[PDB]
Write a protein that binds this ligand. Structure first.
Ligand SMILES: [Ca+2]
Ligand SMILES: [Ca+2]
Ligand SMILES: [Zn+2]
Lengths: 155, 104
């Protein structure tokens, strides 16, 4: 259906309005998942054709995420296309093994994504953040001028 | 006779609004001890997903840190590196993402 009337998040706003790792948001960090580990096997790739994965790693790591993260991300892909026809959801970081995120980042568990719109139009990111809240991410933070960070609770 | 395994980038941090410093480990043994002429450091704004947009600095083989300069303020970059010799280039390292500082 038609684009929605939305209230965007402000730069550096997060929703819910509590720290990411608290119970009301995404909950605690449970430990890095390394490629070589048994827990790595519970991550599966998101191959949704309506999402762009940056994949600067050329490894497909950005596609790996928990099912809870995948379901929210997929809902979000639909609402982005409906909000701005001709524009898609883009993921810059999904699960990570490059190691630039703060220690205890939910990226290391496949429980977070950093996203933009596919046109990199920063005027849309506050609205993109509101759609991520509406898509059911357990925490959404307009973290940087460069991207919005979204995460989920542990399965 | 190219090196195969690349360096691993351990840290990237903004020095100021136009400059980012990275540090890396490279253990020559990982390539049987093969000798390297230096490292290539590649960096591209994170808004680009075109591999053609990486710019390249060269540093010498004894260096394990480098400051990339003449970057844009408050801008995220993708940063990866290789070691090389006459035989060719290693695999790329891990790819870091790091923003310069906002303008003072
Ligand atoms: Ca990535
Ligand atoms: Ca990564
Ligand atoms: Zn993030």
């Amino acid at each position: 259906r038609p684009p929605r009337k939305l209230v965007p998040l402000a730069y550096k706003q997060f929703s819910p309005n509590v720290p990411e790792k608290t119970l009301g948001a995404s909950g605690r960090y449970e430990g890095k998942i390394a490629r070589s580990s048994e827990r790595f096997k519970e991550l599966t790739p998101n191959y949704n054709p309506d999402i762009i994965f940056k994949d600067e790693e050329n490894t497909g790591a950005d596609r790996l995420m928990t099912q809870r993260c995948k379901d929210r991300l997929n809902s979000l892909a639909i609402s982005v296309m409906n909000q701005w026809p001709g524009v898609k959801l883009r993921v810059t970081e999904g699960w990570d093994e490059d190691g630039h995120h703060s220690e205890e980042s939910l990226h290391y568990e496949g429980r977070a994504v950093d996203i933009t719109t596919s046109d990199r139009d920063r005027n849309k990111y506050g609205l993109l953040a509101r759609l991520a809240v509406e898509a059911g991410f357990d925490w959404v933070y307009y973290e940087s001028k460069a991207h919005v960070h979204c995460s989920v609770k542990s399965e | 006779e190219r090196p195969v395994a690349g360096p691993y980038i351990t840290f990237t941090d903004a020095v100021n609004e136009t400059t980012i410093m990275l540090k890396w480990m490279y253990i020559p043994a990982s390539n049987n001890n093969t000798p390297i002429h230096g490292f290539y450091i590649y960096y591209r704004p994170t808004d680009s997903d075109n591999d053609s947009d990486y710019k390249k600095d060269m540093v010498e083989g004894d260096k394990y840190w480098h400051s990339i300069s003449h970057l844009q303020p408050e801008t995220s970059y993708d940063i990866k590196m290789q070691c090389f010799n006459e035989g060719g280039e290693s695999e790329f390292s891990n790819v870091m993402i790091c923003e310069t500082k906002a303008r003072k």
